[PDB]
Design a protein around this ligand. Structure first.
Ligand code: CLA
Ligand code: CLA
Ligand code: CLA
Ligand code: CLA
Ligand code: CLA
Ligand code: CLA
Ligand code: KC2
Ligand code: II0
Ligand code: II0
Ligand code: IHT
Ligand code: 8CT
Ligand code: 8CT
Lengths: 92, 188, 173, 176
C-alpha cells in the first residue's frame, strides 16, 4: 500500500468497459467520427490496400512507393471496421 | 399527380390476387403495390429508393445519351475512336487510352468526376439511413426551380416512372447493340 | 443544413465561427482531430500555395540575372531538380526549417489556446488595425489561398502534361 | 414419461415434445447438458448448410455456370480448382450473412433460426408455418446424412454422385 502513485500521460481517461461496446474514448482522435464514415473508410481502405498489394505481390527490385504506402490500408481497414462496430453500438 | 388513389398509393395493387408486403410504404412516390419477392422486407426501403432513383437517373441519362450519340457526335471524336457506337465507344476510348493517345481519356475523366460526386454524397445516404432529414433521393438540386410547390407531386412520380422506363430501355438498347451492332436509331 | 452542400447536415465541428466557414466538410474530416490544428494547416497551405502560384507566374515572366545559365530550359519542377544540385534549394530549406521550428513553438501554443491559428503577429505595414479591415482581409486571405492551392495544382499538372509553364502555356495553347 | 423415438426408454426431461422436430430422441442426453436453444439453432444451421450442400453436390453434374464449365463434376476437385479469389469472395459473402447470426445469437433473443428471412411471406399461416418448421428440420437432417455420405463417396470414388451411381462402383477398394 506504500507504493508511489503511478504516473500516467496527460488526459488519461477510464476506458474499462463491461457494456456491449467500448466508450468511444477508445478511438481517441477519431472518437467523434461517424459510424457511416468508419464504414466507408473501411471499405475504401480494404479495396485500395488489396489493389496496391496485388500491384506488388510479385515484388520487383523497384516497387512503387505509393503502392507500398497504400498496401498499409488493408491492415488499416480492419481497425476502421472495428471502430465502425464500436461507433454503431455507442449511439452513432 | 400524387393522386394517392389513382396512380400511386393506397389500394393500388399491381397483383390483385396477392397483397403487397407490410413493409412497403404507401407514402412513397411510385407505390403501385409491387414487391412480390419481398425485397422491402429484407432491405431498408430508404436504401432501395435511393438505389431506384440513382439507377433511374443513370439509365435515363444513358438512354438519352445513346440516342444523342447515334444521331450526333461532337466535332473530332471520330478521329480518336473511329466509328464506335454505344459500349463500343466506351471500349474504344479505353483502348486509345492504353494505346497512348492523350486525347482518349474521356472515360477516365468521367469516372474521376462521377466518383468524386458519389464519394462526397455517400454521407447523404448514411444520414438518410440514420433517420436524417434527407429523403432517399432528394439532393436539393433544383436550380431552375422547376419542381416547386404543386408540381412536386407529378414531378416525383414522373421522375420515378420515366426512370423505370429508361432502366428497361437502356437494357434493350445495349443488348440490341450486342446482337445487331447497331444503335438505338439504326435498329428502328 | 450545410449551406455549401445543401443535402448534408452541417458539420458538427464547424459552427460557422471561423472565417470562410460555409459548412463544407462532406467527408467529416473535421470530426477527426482538432479544428485549430486543421485551420493552422489550412492557412499554412494557403500562404505557401499562393506564394507558389505567384512565384510560378513570376518565374515564367522574369528570371534573375545568371539563372538561365544554371537552369537552362528548365521550368517548374525541373528548376527544382536543377538547383538542388546547385545548392539553392538547400539554403531555402535551411532557412524555412528555422522559421518552421519557431512555427512549431507557435503551433504548440495554438493547441494550448494561447495563439489564434495562423496568427504570427506579422503586420509591418500595419494594414490590419481597423478590426473591420482585418475581418475582411482574413476572408480575402482564406479565399485567395484556396484559389491559389487549386491554381498551383493546375499549373504544376499542366507543366506535367505539356512541359510548359503557366503563362507560356496560356500564350500559345 | 416415455420417449416417442425409443419406446422402451424414458422421455428426456428437457425434450417435452413441444418444440418443432421433437420425438424425444436423445439417447446420449445432449439436451440435459447444453443449452437447448443453442442446440436447436445449431441443428437448424447445419441442416440449412447441408441442404444447400446436397443440392450443390449434384447440380454441377446436371448444369454448370458457363464460367466454371471446365471445373470437374467432382465437387471436391471443383473446390480445389476454383482458386483463392473466388473462394475468398464466397467466404466474405458467408461472413456477411453470418454477421446477422452473430448479432441474433450474442446480442438478441428470437426463435431458434429466426433471422427475419421470409421474403415470400410463406410463414404467415400458423398451420403451414408449423408444417414448414418441422419440414425444415427434417429435410435438414436428411441433407446432413446425405451430404456426409456424398462427401465420403466422392472421397472414395473420386467422382460425382450421379456418375458413381451410373458406373455402379458402389463398393470400395480400400482407403484412398
Ligand atoms: C450514362 C451516361 C452517359 C455516358 C456514360 C456517356 C459517355 C460518353 N459520351 Mg455521352 N452523352 C450523354 C450521357 C452519357 N454519355 C447524354 C445524356 C448525352 C445527350 C445530352 C450525351 C451526348 C453525347 C455526345 C453527343 C457524344 C457523347 C460522347 C460520349 C463519350 C465521351 C464523353 C462525352 O463527350 O459526353 C458528352 C456528354 C454530354 C455533353 C452530356 C452528358 C451530361 C449531362 C448533361 C448530365 C462517352 C462514351 C461522345 C462520343 O464519343 O460518343 C460515342 C459524343 O460525341 N455523349
Ligand atoms: C468528346 C471529346 C472530344 C474529343 C476527343 C475531341 C477532339 C478534338 N476536337 Mg473537339 N470538341 C468537343 C469534344 C471533343 N473533341 C466538344 C464537347 C466540343 C464542343 C464544345 C468540341 C468542339 C470542337 C471544335 C469546334 C473543334 C474541335 C476539334 C477537335 C479535334 C482537333 C480533336 C481531335 C477541331 C476540329 O476537328 O476542327 C475541324 C475543332 O476545330 N472540337
Ligand atoms: C425526365 C425525368 C426526370 C424527372 C421528371 C425529374 C424530376 C425531378 N428531379 Mg431530376 N433528374 C433526372 C431526370 C428527371 N428528374 C436525371 C436524368 C437526372 C440525372 C442527372 C436527375 C438528377 C436529379 C437530381 C440529382 C435531383 C433531381 C431532382 C429532381 C426534382 C427537382 C425538381 C425538378 O428539377 O423537376 C424536374 C424537371 C425536369 C425533369 C425538367 C428537365 C427534363 C428535360 C426536359 C429533359 C432533358 C433531356 C436531355 C436530352 C438530356 C424532380 C422531382 C432533385 C430532387 O429533389 O430529387 C428528388 C435533385 O436533387 N434530379
Ligand atoms: C512557394 C514559393 C516559392 C518557391 C518555393 C520558390 C522557388 C524558387 N524560386 Mg522563386 N519566387 C517566388 C516564390 C517561390 N519561389 C515568388 C512569389 C516570386 C515573385 C517575386 C519568385 C520569383 C522568382 C524569380 C524571379 C526566380 C525565382 C527562382 C526560384 C528558384 C531559386 C530561388 C530564387 O532565386 O528565388 C528568388 C526569389 C525571390 C528573391 C523572391 C522571393 C519572395 C518571397 C517568396 C516572399 C517574401 C515576402 C516577405 C516576407 C514580405 C526556386 C525554384 C529563380 C529561378 O530559377 O526561376 C526559374 C528565379 O530566377 N523565383
Ligand atoms: C454448401 C454450399 C455450396 C458450396 C460450398 C458450393 C461451392 C461451389 N459451387 Mg455451388 N452450388 C450450391 C451450393 C454450394 N456450392 C447450390 C445450392 C447450387 C444449386 C443452385 C449450386 C450450384 C452450382 C453450380 C451450377 C456450379 C457451382 C459451382 C461451385 C464451385 C464454384 C463456385 C460457384 O460457382 O458457386 C455457384 C453457386 C451457386 C450459384 C449457388 C450457391 C448459393 C446459394 C444461392 C445459397 C464451388 C466448389 C461451379 C462449379 O465449379 O461447378 C463444377 C458451378 O458451375 N455450384
Ligand atoms: C442418404 C444416405 C446414404 C446413402 C443413400 C448411401 C449410399 C451409399 N453409400 Mg453410404 N454413407 C452414408 C450415407 C448414405 N450412403 C453416411 C452417412 C456415411 C458415413 C459418413 C456413409 C459412408 C459410406 C462409405 C464409407 C461408403 C459408402 C458407400 C455407399 C454406396 C454403397 C453402399 C453399400 O454398399 O451398402 C452396403 C450396406 C451395408 C454394409 C449396411 C451396413 C451393415 C449393417 C449391419 C446394417 C444394419 C441394419 C439395421 C437394421 C440398421 C438400423 C438399426 C437401428 C435402427 C438400430 C452407396 C451409394 C460405399 C461407396 O460408395 O464406395 C465407393 C462406401 O464405401 N457410404
Ligand atoms: C539581383 C540579384 C540576383 C539574384 C537574386 C541572383 C540569383 C541567382 C541564382 C538564384 C538562386 C542563381 C542560381 C544565380 C546564378 C548566377 N548569377 Mg545571379 N543573381 C543576382 C544578380 C546577379 C548579377 C548581377 C550577376 C549574376 C551572375 C550569375 C551567374 C554567372 C554566370 C556566368 O557568368 O557564367 C550565375 C551562374 C553574374 C552574371 O554572369 O550575370 C550576367 C552577374 O554578374 N547574378 N543568380
Ligand atoms: C500580409 C502582409 C503582406 C503581405 C504579403 C504578401 C507578399 C502577399 C502575397 C500574396 C500572394 C502572392 C497571393 C497570390 C495569390 C495567387 C492566386 C490566388 C493564384 C491563382 C491562380 C490561378 C487561379 C490559376 C491558374 C492557372 C492555372 C491553374 C492554369 C495555368 O496554365 C495558368 C492559370 C493562371 C490560368 C504585406 C507585404 C502587405 C505586409 C503586411 O503588413 C502583411
Ligand atoms: C427460406 C425461404 C426460401 C427458401 C429456400 C430455399 C432456397 C430452400 C432450399 C432447400 C433445399 C435446396 C433443400 C435440399 C434438400 C436436400 C436433401 C434433403 C438431400 C438429401 C440427399 C440424400 C438423402 C441423399 C443421397 C444420396 C446419397 C447420400 C448417396 C447417393 O449415392 C444416392 C443419394 C443421391 C440418394 C425462399 C428463398 C423461397 C424464400 C421464402 O420466404 C422462404
Ligand atoms: C458499358 C459496357 C457494357 C455495358 C453495359 C450496360 C449498360 C448494360 C446494361 C444492361 C441492362 C440495363 C440490362 C437490363 C435488363 C432488364 C431486364 C432483363 C428487364 C426485364 C423486365 C421484366 C422481365 C419485366 C416484367 C414485368 C414486370 C416485372 C412488371 C410489370 C410487367 C412487366 C414490365 C412486363 C458491356 C456489358 C457491353 C461491356 C462493355 O465492355 C462495357
Ligand atoms: C532525411 C534525413 C537527413 C538526416 C537525418 C534525418 C533523421 C533527419 C534523415 C531523415 C530520414 C527519414 C525521415 C527517413 C525515412 C525513411 C522511411 C520511412 C523509409 C521507409 C522505407 C520502407 C519501405 C521501402 C517499405 C517497403 C515495403 C515493401 C516492399 C513491402 C512489400 C510487400 C508489399 C507492399 C505488399 C505485398 C507483400 C510484400 C511483397 C511483402
Ligand atoms: C476439410 C476437409 C478435409 C478432407 C476432406 C475434404 C476435402 C472433403 C474437406 C471437407 C470435409 C467435410 C466437410 C466432411 C464432412 C463430413 C460429414 C458431413 C460426415 C457425416 C457423417 C454422418 C454420419 C456418420 C451419420 C450417421 C448416422 C447414423 C448412424 C444414423 C442412424 C440411425 C438410424 C439408422 C435409425 C434411427 C436412429 C439413428 C441413430 C438416427
Amino acid at each position: 500500500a506504500g507504493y508511489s502513485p503511478v504516473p500516467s500521460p496527460d488526459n488519461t481517461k477510464e476506458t474499462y468497459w463491461e457494456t456491449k461496446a467500448p466508450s468511444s474514448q477508445v478511438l481517441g482522435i477519431g472518437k467523434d467520427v461517424s459510424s457511416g464514415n468508419y464504414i466507408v473508410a473501411s471499405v475504401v481502405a480494404a479495396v485500395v490496400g488489396a489493389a496496391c498489394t496485388g500491384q506488388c505481390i510479385p515484388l520487383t527490385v523497384s516497387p512503387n512507393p505509393v503502392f507500398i504506402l497504400g498496401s498499409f490500408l488493408l491492415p488499416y481497414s480492419w481497425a476502421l471496421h472495428v471502430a465502425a462496430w464500436i461507433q454503431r453500438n455507442n449511439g452513432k | 399527380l400524387w393522386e394517392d388513389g389513382k396512380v400511386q398509393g393506397k389500394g393500388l395493387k399491381a397483383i390483385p390476387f396477392s397483397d403487397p408486403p407490410e413493409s412497403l410504404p404507401s407514402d412513397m412516390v411510385g407505390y403501385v403495390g409491387f414487391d412480390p419477392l419481398g425485397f422491402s422486407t429484407l432491405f431498408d426501403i430508404k436504401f432501395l429508393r435511393e438505389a431506384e432513383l440513382k439507377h433511374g437517373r443513370a439509365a435515363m441519362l444513358a438512354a438519352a445519351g445513346a440516342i444523342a450519340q447515334d444521331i450526333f457526335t461532337f466535332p473530332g471524336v471520330t478521329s480518336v475512336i473511329g466509328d464506335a457506337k454505344m459500349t463500343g465507344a466506351h471500349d474504344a476510348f479505353l483502348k486509345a487510352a492504353a494505346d497512348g493517345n492523350p486525347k482518349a481519356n474521356a472515360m477516365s475523366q468521367l469516372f474521376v468526376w462521377i466518383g468524386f460526386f458519389e464519394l462526397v454524397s455517400m454521407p447523404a445516404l448514411f444520414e438518410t439511413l440514420n433517420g436524417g432529414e434527407r429523403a432517399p433521393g432528394d439532393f436539393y438540386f433544383d436550380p431552375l426551380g422547376l419542381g416547386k410547390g404543386s408540381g412536386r407531386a407529378r414531378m416525383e412520380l414522373a421522375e420515378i416512372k420515366n426512370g423505370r422506363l429508361a432502366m428497361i430501355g437502356i437494357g434493350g438498347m445495349v443488348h440490341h447493340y450486342l446482337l445487331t451492332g447497331k444503335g438505338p436509331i439504326g435498329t428502328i | 443544413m450545410s449551406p455549401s452542400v445543401p443535402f448534408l447536415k452541417r458539420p458538427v465541428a464547424l459552427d460557422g465561427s471561423m472565417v470562410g466557414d460555409v459548412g463544407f466538410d462532406p467527408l467529416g474530416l473535421s470530426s477527426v482531430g482538432d479544428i485549430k490544428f486543421l485551420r493552422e494547416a489550412e492557412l499554412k497551405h494557403c500562404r505557401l500555395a499562393m506564394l507558389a502560384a505567384a512565384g510560378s507566374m513570376a518565374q515564367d515572366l522574369y528570371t534573375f540575372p545568371g539563372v538561365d545559365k544554371v537552369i537552362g530550359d528548365a521550368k517548374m519542377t525541373a528548376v527544382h531538380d536543377k538547383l538542388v544540385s546547385q545548392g539553392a534549394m538547400g539554403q531555402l530549406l535551411v532557412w524555412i526549417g528555422f522559421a518552421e521550428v519557431f512555427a512549431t513553438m507557435a503551433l504548440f501554443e495554438t493547441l494550448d489556446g494561447k495563439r489564434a491559428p495562423g496568427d504570427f503577429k506579422f503586420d509591418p505595414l500595419g494594414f490590419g488595425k481597423n478590426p473591420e479591415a482585418l475581418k475582411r482581409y482574413q476572408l480575402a486571405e482564406i479565399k485567395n489561398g484556396r484559389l491559389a492551392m487549386l491554381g498551383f495544382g493546375g499549373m504544376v499538372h499542366g507543366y506535367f502534361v505539356t512541359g510548359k509553364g503557366p503563362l507560356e502555356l496560356l500564350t500559345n495553347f | 414419461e416415455m420417449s416417442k423415438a425409443i419406446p422402451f426408454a424414458e422421455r428426456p426431461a428437457k425434450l417435452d415434445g413441444k418444440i418443432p422436430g421433437d420425438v424425444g430422441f436423445d439417447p446420449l442426453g445432449f439436451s440435459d447438458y447444453y443449452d437447448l436453444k443453442y442446440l436447436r439453432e445449431a441443428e437448424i444451421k447445419h441442416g440449412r448448410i447441408c441442404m444447400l450442400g446436397a443440392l450443390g453436390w449434384l447440380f454441377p453434374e446436371f448444369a454448370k455456370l458457363p464460367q466454371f464449365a471446365s471445373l470437374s463434376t467432382n465437387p471436391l476437385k471443383a473446390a480445389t480448382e476454383l482458386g483463392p479469389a473466388g473462394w475468398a469472395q464466397i467466404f466474405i459473402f458467408v461472413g456477411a450473412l453470418e454477421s446477422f447470426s452473430y448479432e441474433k445469437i450474442y446480442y438478441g433473443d428470437s426463435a431458434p433460426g429466426d433471422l427475419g428471412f421470409d421474403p415470400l411471406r410463406l410463414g404467415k399461416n400458423p398451420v403451414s408455418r408449423a408444417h414448414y418448421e418441422v419440414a425444415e428440420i427434417k429435410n435438414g437432417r436428411l441433407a446432413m446424412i446425405g451430404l456426409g455420405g456424398m462427401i465420403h463417396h466422392s472421397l472414395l470414388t473420386k467422382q460425382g454422385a450421379i456418375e458413381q451411381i451410373m458406373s455402379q462402383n458402389f463398393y470400395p477398394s480400400g482407403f484412398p
